[model samples]
Target: DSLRPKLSEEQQRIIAILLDAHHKTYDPTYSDFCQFRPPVRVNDGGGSVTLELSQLSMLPHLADLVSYSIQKVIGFAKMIPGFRDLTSEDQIVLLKSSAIEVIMLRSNESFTMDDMSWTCGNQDYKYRVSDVTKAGHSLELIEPLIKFQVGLKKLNLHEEEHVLLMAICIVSPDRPGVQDAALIEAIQDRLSNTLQTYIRCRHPPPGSHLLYAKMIQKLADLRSLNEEHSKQYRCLSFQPECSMKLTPLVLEVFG
Candidate 1:
């Protein structure tokens, strides 16, 4: 059902407004922006997740810029007369940690259900939502299943979105022995290290990261579940732990 390949002018304009607000909040000067390039994948393998920034270029959306902005904000926040002071380097690290949360909140606020669900390319190949959960549960869909559709002026899937991230789940078909929160948290922790292991090209154990993808695949199990197992629909269901059903809009936009 999707009919567009790029965001509309209206969408772009909205993003611009948010971007300006963010810029003012951080006040990143050109020099601060140029301090470092986005962290590169030096080693995705298991050793030490590190980056070699010697030859990096300065891109506004790169992690370094985000980190710089975050550090500046933290610096000001921590400057309450008697509050604990963070070192310049530590300020930068703290910023990096908080950047994801800020980005998620802002992006979610700016994008609409339509923008989130707009998909192009192939309509026949679209996936379907299996079932709805209790009246109040649902999740917004995004693209590449890896990119942040909510934040940034341009959609940067290959670069900025490449970092491993995590999500939550509410309804599940096959319940794991562990709690969902614990499971999601563990997955997120392993994801960064796992991506590091792979990028580094070091030979980690075979079963090591295989489980991560398995978890993701299981995430799709929600598509097959519906609101009820009414006898008419033979609802004895096989399900996965997803926060909610995927909306038709999300599928379209992501494509």
Candidate 2:
């Protein structure tokens, strides 16, 4: 016999497009990106970094990493079907509002559970809350960020789910200042249905229903995290000490 509920033709098409978009723009697993960087676990007992403030040196490094990720997220956004059809202003607005949230989602890809550190990029850097605080973000944001990353990673989502989640995050309709709320809402609804179909057909059993609700809860969590980050980042930018650390792209969005 066949699987109980196979994906409909339309659902498969969405999966294919989203999967392609993800592979082209991002590596969900980061597998093979780095040969090896044997984690220096010197009995740190989890993120035990004596930053010494890292003398604020961590500020620019953190900003640079996030700015680069922001660029990649925008690149991914441009590939989502129907995204470019929106007015240029709305397209930009969506990114300005949602990029950080997506970045938080993306973080789970490289997150290491044992250490709770994010090892990413071409360098051997492992990001922890201490480093984030050294970069001027507060625990208020960092704690929830850690929780979000942990929860999302544990979901063990397939590439299709991950891709669609990021796409959905980018197209949220309620972001303030959007000119065409109705159009964006319709787009988001389509994405929601696509995900619903995907989980129903791909994930077996009564468990499938719970998975969808869990994901929507994560999206709501992202909204709260985004709000907190916006407040904290605005303060960081306004402060002359940290202002220069932000790249032009970072400034353009959060400035």
Candidate 3:
């Protein structure tokens, strides 16, 4: 079992579904599916769905994909030299601490559009960035919505993508063609030694724009390699239930 503990009952049920779909026993390699389940709400009453172990294992290949992505990100971040020389354990801790930010690093991409299908706080709202009408303007619109939400009289929600919202502080965006200056600035500010450097880190980290560019470039390279292999290896319809064709925007980019 993973140090993360055993799967919950619902997750086991999902595992059973995956197993039955493949006509084979569950494999631990695919455990990442549990975490990949998009954060969602329950149809009954309310509350978000949590990830499980067996459920996590369902998408083994994607997990490897993410690991590669993070590794590349880590490699790029290390160019600063100070952060690069830390013990492997410390490096991993830094990455883990910034894990969520890493995932959000790709949020602005067209392929992974932000389906703001969320009801943060007391409001029940779902904004779809993919659809202009449904999404209602840019992230800029989110400002008033958030102000209305957090009891702030006047707040600019879309003015900047919040660090908490993006999750990863070190990993940069890997999407092909989006240039989100605000998001980049947010990550840079967060990863600076002022906050990201743990008391345990052996040396104080350095700050420089060159290092930032390297990190972002690394993010792009990692995404390209991962997406390329995922296209070849992970895009299989092994079973009926597991059969869904994904049409990457990269394939039919009409620009």
Candidate 4:
């Protein structure tokens, strides 16, 4: 059995709101990540189907879902203990930079190790290992994404750890144009220290430190994922044939 944090009244209230927002927007029953799936399969000769402009157009709608979740994360961040202490501009900068990382992190649940595929959509649309690269997306991006998913699966992180991980991602201090870098840095340190202490108490002796390092490395992997995703998003936005229009939220971050 997992242990629960002994939260105070305000902490409990804030966390409850955060949890509710996550469930409302993310909906664990369906994927809010995995925006790209295998181009609908071809029946003849077992060849991969060509991506249609119509199908590509739908990507923005899926992106909207992911953006909504990011919006919720931003909403909930305001309720975090001292998140509001930072200047509003700094808060926006933090959320914008970290949102994609959090999305990628939460999207890990959609990955299937056995098939090396991501379970996208409500039905059967899945992105296989080679499918994305074939669709003109980068293998460099997909490879690291798959690698990160594999690493995270091996860790078998607990829900409590996940909450802290999301918290850490939201307050990432490396975001550009941050007005109050010192404040954000201090917050990141406190949150990281708290998580480290929690891991020390929860895990078997000595392995705790290593485990902490392993998880921290996943965040580093997310930075790469963010860069690759931005590149892909830009490509899709400018594709002449596909004529995709990025959602405002995505454009705000990626543009």
Highest TM-score among the candidates is held by which one?
2
* Candidate that beats the other on lDDT, 2 or 4, i.e. the better one: 2
* TM-scores for every predicted model: 0.21, 0.84, 0.26, 0.76
Candidate 1 lDDT over 1-255, as tens digits, reads: 522234345434433443443444543224343344322222212322111122111111233333443444444334322112324443333333333343333232223344443121133211112111111112332222213333322322221112222111211113333234343344334333443333234323453334445434433422222211112112211122111222222212111
What's model 1's lDDT at 191? 34
> What lDDT, from 0 to 1, does candidate 3 have?
0.32
User: In lDDT terms, which candidate is top?
Assistant: 2
Q: Summarize candidate 2's per-residue lDDT along 137-242 as a digit string, tens digits.
A: 6779999999998988877777788888888999999899999998998887777888877887787655564787889899999999999999988876655556
Residue pairs clashing in model 4 are: none
lDDT of each: 0.29, 0.77, 0.32, 0.66
Candidate 3 on 1-255: residue-level lDDT in tens? 312233445434433332242222212233333443232322322211122211222233233334444544444445422343444644555554443234334322212113333222222112232221111122333332232223211111120122212222443333333245345444444443322222113212342223334433434443443344334333232322232221232122210
Better of 1 and 2 by TM-score: 2
Which window of 10 residues has the lowest lDDT sum in candidate 3?
A: 152-161
- Model 3 misplaced regions, further than 4 Å: 1-58, 110-168, 171-255
When 3 and 4 are scored with lDDT, the better candidate is: 4
Overall local distance difference test of candidate 1: 0.29
